[PDB]
Write a protein that binds this ligand. Structure first.
Ligand SMILES: OC[C@H]1O[C@@H](O)[C@H](O)[C@@H](O)[C@H]1O
Length: 719
C-alpha cells in the first residue's frame, strides 16, 4: 500500500517517518478514480468543536522543510530534524527519508482549515479551525493529505493535483491564464510615493524610465489613489467611495477621474496595462458602515498560531479599530461597481491586497473558509467580467483558505515586501521568495515583488527577479534609476526574458537553510525553453527569530562561503536538450557577471564562493554533439541576467554541420562551439563574430530589435 498507518506508526515505502499515531487518527485512499498513491488523514473527536488539535505522530531524526506564517499575511522557511522545531502555522511540510520525499498538505475541509504545529514532545500536530464559534465539528476525513515519491518537486505537484481532484475548488498554476503584464517590465508607485502618490507622480515615473531606454509597459498605481477617511493613536482609514480621490482627477476638469492618468499612461507614454491597488475589503479599515454595500464593523478574531508567531497582531490598528466588512450578500455588487468603474476608465487589473484578513472576520458568517470562499468567488467573477486578461495579483494572501480556492487568479506575491531602508530584509527576501515558491508556485505564478534599481542590494534583487519566472518591476522614485542594471532585465521595447517555471531552491538546498545553517549557499533554478538558469546567493546572517518573533541579524562564523554547482542542479535541465535520449548530461555554463564560459561534464562540480549579499547567475545549456569534435550549446543574450530566455527556437542539422535558432531581443548573443564557426548568418546576411578558441565562446551583436512584428532574429551558425 506504500503510505499506511500500521500499528501506531506511519510508514512510507517501508520507512517509519512517524511513531505513536493516536488511535483516533483515521486514514483513507478512496476517491472517485479510487487508487490514491498517498493518503488522506483525519480524526474523530468526542465533542462538537470549532477548534481542534490532534497529534498525527511523533517525528524524530528526519530532515524537514516547512513554510510557516510568521505573520497572518506571509510565510517563510524553517528547516529541522525534530517535530518540536516545526513552527506554528506550518502550511506546507516536506520530509526527507535517507532518496525518498514526503509532503504533508494540511487542507481545508468543509468549513475548516488546518495547519501543522510542532510540540515539545516532537509530535506533529494537526490544528483544525473554523474561525467561528457557531461552526462546530467532531469528525474529519480529509484535513491532511500525505504523499511520497522520489522526485521532491514531482511529489509536491502530484500531491497538489490529488488534493485538487478531491476538492475541485482550485486550479494548479499551469492551468490558469497568466495576464499579459508578466511579459513586460513594469513600475509600481509604492516605494516611490507611498500613499502620497498623485497622477503627476505616475506620469513622471513612467517618463523617467522610458527616457533611459527601459520603458515599462505596465504600471501599478498602488495604495493612495482611493477615496478614504478616518472615522468622524494613529487612526485607521475607511473607503468612502469607489472612485479616485482628488489627486487622480484631471486638474482642469474635476468630472474626469482616473481615466485621465490611464489615457496619459497608454496613449501618451505607450503603456499596455494599467493596474490599481485595493484591499480585498476595499481599504485597510474596510468600507465605511453603510447601506449601499451592507458594511458593518467587524473586529479581527485572533487565532493562537498566528498570535503566537506574530504577537504585534494583538495590538495592530486593524485588530483594535476594526474594519467595515462589506456584506457577503453585497460583496459582488461592491467588486463589480468598483471594477466596472475601473474597467470603463481603461484599467486592466488590480493588485488585491490585505487578503488574509477575511480568516479573522468569519464570526457571524460561516467562519474562515466560507468567508474567504465567498469573497473570492465574487472577486473572481468581477475580475473575469471587468479585467478579462485575468488582471489580478494576490497580495498578503498566504493562507490555505485562499490557496485552496484559487480557481482563477494566476499571480501571487510570494513574500513580504521589498524594504529599501531595512538592511535585514534583503537576504531574507531572497530566501522567502525561493522557499515559498516551492509551494505557492503550485497554485499561481510567484511574484517576487518590486525592488530599487539604485540600492546597495539592487543587483542581488534584480538578478533574483530575472530568474523568478514572474513579473519584473521596480518601485524607483522618478529619476533614481540605474539603467545599466535595467538593461540586464528589460529590452528596448519593454519586453523581458521570463523563465518558464516558479524559481525554486535546488534539490541540494531544500533541507539546508541558507539563511541560518551558516554553511550553505542558496541555489535557485529555473528553466527556459533551451537553457536552464541557476542563480547562487549567500543569504546567511538574517532570519525571523523564534524568540524575538521578528526579522533580525544573527551571528555568522565566516563572511565568505564556498558551495558548488552542477549542470544537474537545474532540476529539469533535460527538457532543454533537443535530444534528451542521446544527451550525455554535459552542459555549457556561462557566468553572467564574470563573463566566463566553462564546459561542465555531467556530474563535475564547479566551486562558487560568495560573501553575504553577493550572488552569481549562470546560464546552463545542454551541449549537443553534432559529430565527434563538433559540439554546441546556445547561451543567449549574455549581457542579460536570464540570457537563455532569448532563445525561442533551436534546431541542429548535423548532416549540414549547421545550427538554426530563433532569438528575440537585441544586444550581444553568445553560444558555446567546440570549433570556430565558418559563418554566422543573421536574417540571410553574414555577420561579424568573435571566437575565443579556448572557451569556445562565440559572440556577435544583434544590433536592433526584430524588424516589425517579425518577432525573431533567424540565425544560422555554420560549423
Ligand atoms: O500599503 C500598500 C502596500 O501593502 C503591502 O501589503 C503590499 O505588499 C505592498 O506591496 C503595498 O501594496
Amino acid at each position: 500500500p506504500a503510505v499506511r498507518i500500521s500499528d501506531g506508526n506511519l510508514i512510507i515505502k517501508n520507512r517509519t517517518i512517524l511513531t505513536g499515531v493516536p488511535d483516533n487518527v483515521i486514514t483513507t485512499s478512496a476517491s472517485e478514480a479510487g487508487p490514491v498513491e498517498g493518503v488522506f488523514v483525519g480524526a474523530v473527536f468526542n465533542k462538537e468543536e470549532s477548534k481542534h488539535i490532534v497529534p498525527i505522530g511523533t517525528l524524530r531524526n528526519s530532515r524537514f522543510m516547512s513554510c510557516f506564517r510568521f505573520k497572518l499575511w506571509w510565510m517563510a522557511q524553517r528547516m529541522g530534524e525534530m517535530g518540536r522545531d516545526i513552527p506554528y502555522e506550518t502550511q506546507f511540510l516536506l520530509v526527507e527519508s535517507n532518496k525518498v520525499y514526503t509532503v504533508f498538505l494540511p487542507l481545508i475541509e468543509g468549513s475548516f482549515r488546518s495547519c501543522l504545529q510542532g510540540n515539545v514532545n516532537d509530535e506533529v500536530e494537526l490544528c483544525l479551525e473554523s474561525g467561528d464559534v457557531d461552526t462546530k465539528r467532531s469528525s474529519f476525513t480529509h484535513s491532511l493529505y500525505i504523499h511520497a515519491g522520489t522526485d521532491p518537486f514531482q511529489t509536491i505537484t502530484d500531491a497538489i493535483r490529488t488534493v485538487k481532484l478531491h476538492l475541485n475548488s482550485f486550479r494548479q498554476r499551469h492551468e490558469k491564464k497568466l495576464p499579459g503584464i508578466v511579459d513586460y517590465f513594469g513600475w509600481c508607485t509604492w516605494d516611490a510615493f507611498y500613499q502620497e502618490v498623485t497622477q503627476e507622480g505616475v506620469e513622471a515615473g513612467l517618463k523617467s524610465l522610458a527616457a533611459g531606454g527601459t520603458p515599462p509597459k505596465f504600471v501599478i498605481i498602488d495604495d493612495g489613489w482611493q477615496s478614504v477617511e478616518r472615522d468622524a493613536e494613529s487612526p485607521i482609514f475607511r473607503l468612502t467611495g469607489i472612485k479616485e480621490n482628488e489627486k487622480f482627477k484631471k486638474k482642469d476638469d474635476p468630472n474626469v477621474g482616473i481615466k485621465n492618468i490611464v489615457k496619459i499612461a497608454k496613449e501618451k507614454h505607450g503603456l499596455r496595462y494599467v493596474y490599481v491597488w485595493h484591499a480585498i475589503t476595499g481599504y485597510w479599515g474596510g468600507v465605511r458602515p453603510g447601506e449601499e454595500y451592507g458594511s458593518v464593523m467587524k473586529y479581527p478574531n485572533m487565532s493562537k498560531g498566528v498570535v503566537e508567531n506574530d504577537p504585534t497582531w494583538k495590538t495592530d490598528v486593524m485588530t483594535l479599530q476594526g474594519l467595515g466588512l462589506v456584506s457577503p450578500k453585497k460583496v459582488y455588487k461592491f467588486y463589480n461597481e468598483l471594477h466596472s468603474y475601473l474597467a470603463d476608465a481603461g484599467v486592466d487589473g488590480v493588485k488585491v491586497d490585505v487578503q488574509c484578513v477575511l480568516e479573522t472576520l468569519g464570526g457571524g458568517l460561516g467562519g474562515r473558509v466560507e468567508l474567504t470562499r465567498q469573497f473570492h468567488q465574487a472577486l473572481d467573477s468581477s475580475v473575469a467580467k471587468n479585467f478579462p486578461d485575468n488582471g489580478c495579483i494576490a497580495c498578503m494572501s498566504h493562507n490555505t483558505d485562499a490557496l485552496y480556492c484559487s480557481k482563477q487568479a494566476a499571480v501571487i506575491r510570494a513574500s513580504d515586501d521589498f524594504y529599501p531602508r531595512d538592511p535585514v530584509s534583503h537576504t531574507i527576501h531572497i530566501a522567502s521568495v525561493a522557499y515559498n515558491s516551492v509551494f505557492l508556485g503550485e497554485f499561481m505564478q510567484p511574484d517576487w515583488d518590486m525592488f530599487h534599481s539604485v540600492h546597495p542590494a539592487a543587483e542581488y534583487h534584480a538578478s533574483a527577479r530575472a530568474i523568478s519566472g514572474g513579473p519584473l518591476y521596480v518601485s524607483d522614485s522618478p529619476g533614481k534609476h540605474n539603467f545599466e542594471l535595467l538593461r540586464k532585465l528589460v529590452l528596448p521595447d519593454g519586453s523581458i526574458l521570463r523563465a518558464r517555471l516558479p524559481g525554486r531552491p535546488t534539490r541540494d538546498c531544500l533541507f539546508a537553510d541558507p539563511a541560518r545553517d551558516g554553511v550553505s549557499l542558496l541555489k535557485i533554478w529555473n528553466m527556459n525553453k533551451y537553457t536552464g538558469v541557476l542563480g547562487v546567493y549567500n543569504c546567511q546572517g538574517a532570519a525571523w527569530s523564534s524568540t524575538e518573533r521578528k526579522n533580525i541579524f544573527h551571528q555568522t562564523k565566516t563572511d565568505s562561503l564556498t558551495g558548488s554547482i552542477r549542470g544537474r542542479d537545474v532540476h529539469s535541465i533535460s527538457e532543454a536538450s533537443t535530444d534528451p535520449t542521446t544527451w550525455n548530461g554535459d552542459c555549457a555554463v556561462y557566468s553572467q557577471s564574470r563573463g566566463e564560459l566553462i564546459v561542465m561534464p555531467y556530474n563535475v562540480s564547479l566551486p562558487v564562493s560568495l560573501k553575504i549579499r553577493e550572488h552569481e547567475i549562470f546560464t546552463v545549456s545542454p551541449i549537443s554533439h553534432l559529430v565527434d569534435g563538433v559540439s554546441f550549446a546556445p547561451i543567449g543574450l549574455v549581457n542579460m541576467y536570464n540570457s537563455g530566455g532569448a532563445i525561442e527556437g533551436l534546431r541542429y542539422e548535423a548532416e549540414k554541420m549547421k545550427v538554426v535558432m530563433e532569438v528575440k531581443g537585441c544586444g550581444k548573443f553568445g553560444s558555446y562551439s567546440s570549433v570556430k564557426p565558418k559563418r554566422c548568418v543573421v536574417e540571410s546576411n553574414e555577420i561579424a563574430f568573435e571566437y575565443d578558441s579556448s572557451s569556445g565562446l562565440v559572440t556577435f551583436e544583434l544590433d536592433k530589435m526584430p524588424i516589425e512584428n517579425k518577432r525573431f532574429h533567424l540565425i544560422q551558425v555554420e560549423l
